[PDB]
């Protein structure tokens, strides 16, 4: 009855200011986050103590995670995840290998997202991918991601929502480079080749994603926001925000609105950088908060998909992902409670006292009643409590690994 | 009951589950006041969007406009260029006399009463130095100026039975490519030293000093920068002022506060929001000033830590800008009082980082809410957005006739 | 020419020939490359609506000509929409090429190519911080038909001037705090801008550009026309896109942004300047990303699809030494990036050899591009040195004083 | 030769403004550049690139070719990880005999050498404290280590003439949210304190302290912040430690040197080059490198000042790396030695801010470079990009054996 008197007071409080508590939990159940695989086993695939250490572990960590987050979610594949009981050169990859993936994620009303994977082999050494020198390195890439498309068209055959396929390429130098220009020809031509294929929209979508640096290709990225920028408005693919990814106290809430206007579809990848690109899990805060503010003002629910791009292998990573999974659910709530219209006026007339007067008041409404209660509507813990599954589980089972 | 009583019920049983009492974290917040800046109602004017305050009248109404709006204690901070004299006053030379006003003021109004001399907007100040600079008689001026100052703080703690904090920031440095960093900080030693030679007594005054990375054409160089006044605070033994919008980009006073603390006796924190520089935008309840109270609490600062408020915003009504500003400053300071630290800081000890990093977050969802408007129906204020209406009509009746 | 200019001159020539450099050449190359002087630097942006600021048009060409006496080399003259000349007061939307005779006239004479600029500021109707953006209708069309004026000005400059004129778009609009809706007014500018384009104008002799901006003083939370809105536009309109040195965040460089635009958009004009904690407008050194913006033109051959111009505006100082100074560092950039033996750097970055690519990139630091950059001043009747700074000393005397 | 004929021309240029060529050699003779060990073997010790040192004959005999390319003074900076023992040694048992050999090659080849306290990469740091770790006996390890570190320090200042500045560095921190950040820095404080309790002769050996930002899988808080070192250093009197690449972004070392200096009493500079992060890239002749040496040369900080290179690239060949940086280095200071300071000064002091400007920017196309070769001439260096065959030609008679 605390929850239930709490939610009452709150559904009173929240329509005086003309705000439905009913209808945004409605709202707050169509917008999926697309949960990552990777943090399930630090990004090992299949080709802190704990981390599964194959496809069966990985997905009961998912169902322990799921459990506890309500509402809607999706699942995040890499290529690396593929599930077949020979190798299978990247190169050659095909849906059979992801179908253990599509059963389970029917099973468990999950759509699922894909990414080609660029990285932690042989053929990606030299730190170039799609953008290398080599032709028959480049080719090697180039026919990985033309392979992944075809992965990511049957998940949105068989699951009726398609699937997102990011791509996303570590490709750099670590010093100063003389040679910007042609590794970034030699990226363009070949993302043209990997999006030849025209698949059905239903089922699949294209989206390229920046990044600013990484560790050991701090100096050059050739990948760079303003080469995805171009890329994305010239040739049309979704285009994918990396709230991780950029300069300091640069923002990816402020780009939604700018890059909206010239790209079909958005990817939000959210995560909290710190002091870099850290991948540290997301939390409730400005930033998560800003970004949820924008998808909700412009009513973005079938042209943005968010997902959770995140690495912490220091914590528990079943909680990592809770953690970080119900911040963007409750970020979404309080963008939801907003009273965007009012606030839209005021701003409209100039009334800037009122403006941000009302913006810092929203900020004492309680919408925790009213997160409380979207949790107990999903038979999820509406608090702490859920800490103890994960405990329990650990104990039971992730002890053992 | 009423609904703010129903609510206060359930947060309060709320948070004794965490081991957490609401009624004491009423009291403790009564311990932390905030000293509003003179300065936002006359958009830093002085005595020497439309409706500033034009005179000590009017800025004294218009602060008793937002107080009224503001729960619990607060204290407001003055600068020297608001002395109230009917002659003119060289810098040099104020006196106690000269803010008798304010003081009769502050008494009937409960407030403790901050300071700071003006080593700005004036014509020996004109060359971007002031205590730094290199002619004897102009940086005698400031010296002068500065110790009267300290004078006038004094009285202010004699007579209210608070200390007065006296901050001391100053402009000086450089727009471009500077040759000698050296010179003008060396002479900025020896003058705060001359400054500072006044014995006062601690129960009535305080100096503070207060670094700034850089400000609009003083650049390329500040004679006054962190390093300079940490040294100068910890070998001095001064407070030392931390100001949340003068520093680099991402980097934050609260990370600060527990390492100055262990060399410094007292720490004056200064809060405003920087926005893509040292803007000085109105504070508002961020992740920034939610460290900053956390610090303050978690390590039980009550008596040696100063809050103030130090922006400046005249794109929106005044009175609104110390209303919003304050009240954020005090919901911050709730939430901290609200938060369960001793667990915390076990799990933390613990190597528990799982349970830390998810109670921390869990704590975000904890009823604060229903504890703050109790607070403010308390302390007679306006719990949610109906400030505003006090504040329009203020407006519509004295505002809009100046 | 003295004797050790010319033995400094001949050393170098030997030095660099040994890295397979054409000391020659490389002149040859730098007088492809025009810097456009910014004209607002003159009078503190005042327009025509420290001490000896110019006046007006009369005074702020002869401060240029002393400016560009001691600039060895190709110029261009970037002017805005407030530097026209009229006798009586011209509203912004009605302006027309007979308001730029005199420049124009002047440019000729001076052998100088003309650049503008729509001046979307300092103006009763952009008082509310939005233009182009503006939610009013009225509004709104004044300044898009002072854009669709200005481009009419641009084509005439190119048309007299027998070289394309660049115009670019800035406008300051944007929110100070807490924005709601950061999307309106931005679907607003887009609108807008294709209005303002629609008249189809001869390349040969106009050019468009829009330049974002991060931030505004007083306009800090919010830009309306951000870095992604302006890429956006100008790879989908195909318009130049505009790089400001100052405008970006914090560690974020302009130099990186050139090879990855040029292969979405026509063309760029670099704006050069130096911003110290922020868009501080400082005069350009010759410093780090001075060097990096120089040395990625030239790598990349943009001489046909680059325009450089100059952005900074420094009023503590002297105006004419501020543009000789920025002017003469933007040029020696450029040497320094044209004496570099690229194809051999190249050649080591693309065998892994990046201890050798390290290693050179350092040592031609210390290579003599100084004699070469002399002898460009004195081929160019200009001081080698810092003589020039007497010039600017004796003019300040004669004339700046008396001002 | 040209080099000679470009002297002469350089020599004359120079006298023009006042600057003496000859003087300017002389005095950078006087500024020793500490080359650092662990750039070498990757800093793995001894307890992409092909080619690295594996044990100390190694090491030196890399070393070794990197000083004949070099001009100039030089120290080596070692680590106590470096030590040579035919045993293992506990890290708080480690003694001056561990490091004779070192000594003895020292000794030989005219170097100063210089230390550090190794507490990283040991199974007592992996829970990422050491001086400030709570636990007792791990904390007491490490207080241990640094102490014994002292004692090797001192042995090398008395063996060698030239006191042996030793660093302390610590990982100290938590990669996320951190409840308490005050008991680790109290901890730390303390901890400090008794490693320098032992009264050793400063002729022999100096203490320095050095902060750090943020570290991978460390970024959230450091325990060792900028703001506790300068208040240790200033309060306790050790040197203090200035990272290039350990600060916020667009924050520089080159305006803390005159801040520090007026409460610390000796400076210990690290030169590198932070990339996005405190990715210690090789120095360049850079603006921020050329801005260090020029705040040196200009206070005279000859004998307040200890010039050392702190990055590591194990992407490159390892002994072109040290060249690289220590050659920067060495061309900044020769930079600042070329400046006409004095007549700067009197312009800046004047107010007359266009000249500065003016001729700061002019030096930069003085000749300088000749001035470079000469020295490098003189010093029997190559003094062109000659050098790089030289390390060729060691990769391939050497390195290529690894
Ligand atoms: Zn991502
Ligand atoms: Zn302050
Ligand atoms: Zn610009
Ligand atoms: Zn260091």
Excluded at 50 to 76: T, V, Y
Aim: hydrophobic residues 40%; aromatic residues 8%.
């Amino acid at each position: 009855t605390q929850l239930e008197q709490a939610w009452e007071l709150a559904k009173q409080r929240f329509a005086a200011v003309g705000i439905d508590v009913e209808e945004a939990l409605r709202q707050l159940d169509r917008l999926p986050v697309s949960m990552h695989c990777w943090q399930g086993d630090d990004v090992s695939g299949f080709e802190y103590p704990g981390k599964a250490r194959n496809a069966s572990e990985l997905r009961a960590d998912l169902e322990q995670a799921m459990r506890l987050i309500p509402g809607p979610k999706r699942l995040n594949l890499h290529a690396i995840y593929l599930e077949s009981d020979t190798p299978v050169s990247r190169d050659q990859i095909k849906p059979e290998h992801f179908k253990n993936w599509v059963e389970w994620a029917k099973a468990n009303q999950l759509g699922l997202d894909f990414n080609p994977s660029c990285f932690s082999h042989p053929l990606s050494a030299d730190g170039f991918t799609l953008s290398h020198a080599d032709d028959s390195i480049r080719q090697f890439w180039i026919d990985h991601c033309k392979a992944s498309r075809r992965v990511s068209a049957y998940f949105g055959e068989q699951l009726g929502t398609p699937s997102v396929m990011n791509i996303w390429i570590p490709d750099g130098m670590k010093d100063i480079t003389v040679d910007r220009l042609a590794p970034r020809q030699r990226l363009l031509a070949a993302l043209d080749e990997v999006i030849s294929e025209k698949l059905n929209p239903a089922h699949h979508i294209d989206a390229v994603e920046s990044k600013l640096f990484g560790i050991g290709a701090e100096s050059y990225t050739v990948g760079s926001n303003e080469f995805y920028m171009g890329y994305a408005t010239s040739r049309q693919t979704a285009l994918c925000l990396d709230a991780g990814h950029f300069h300091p106290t640069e923002v990816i809430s402020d780009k939604i609105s700018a890059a909206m206007l010239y790209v079909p579809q958005l990817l939000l990848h959210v995560s909290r950088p710190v002091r870099w690109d850290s991948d540290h899990v997301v939390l409730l805060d400005d930033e998560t908060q800003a970004i949820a503010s924008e998808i909700v003002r412009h009513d973005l629910f079938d042209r943005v998909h968010i997902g959770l791009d995140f690495f912490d292998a220091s914590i528990n990573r079943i909680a990592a992902w809770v953690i970080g999974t119900r911040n963007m659910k409750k970020a979404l709530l309080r963008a939801l409670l907003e009273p965007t219209a009012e606030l839209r006026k005021l701003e409209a007339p100039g009334d800037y006292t009122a403006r941000l007067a009302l913006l810092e008041e929203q900020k004492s409404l309680p919408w925790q009643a009213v997160w409380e209660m979207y949790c107990q509507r999903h038979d999820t813990p509406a608090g702490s409590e859920w800490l103890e599954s994960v405990r329990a589980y650990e104990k039971e089972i992730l002890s053992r690994r």
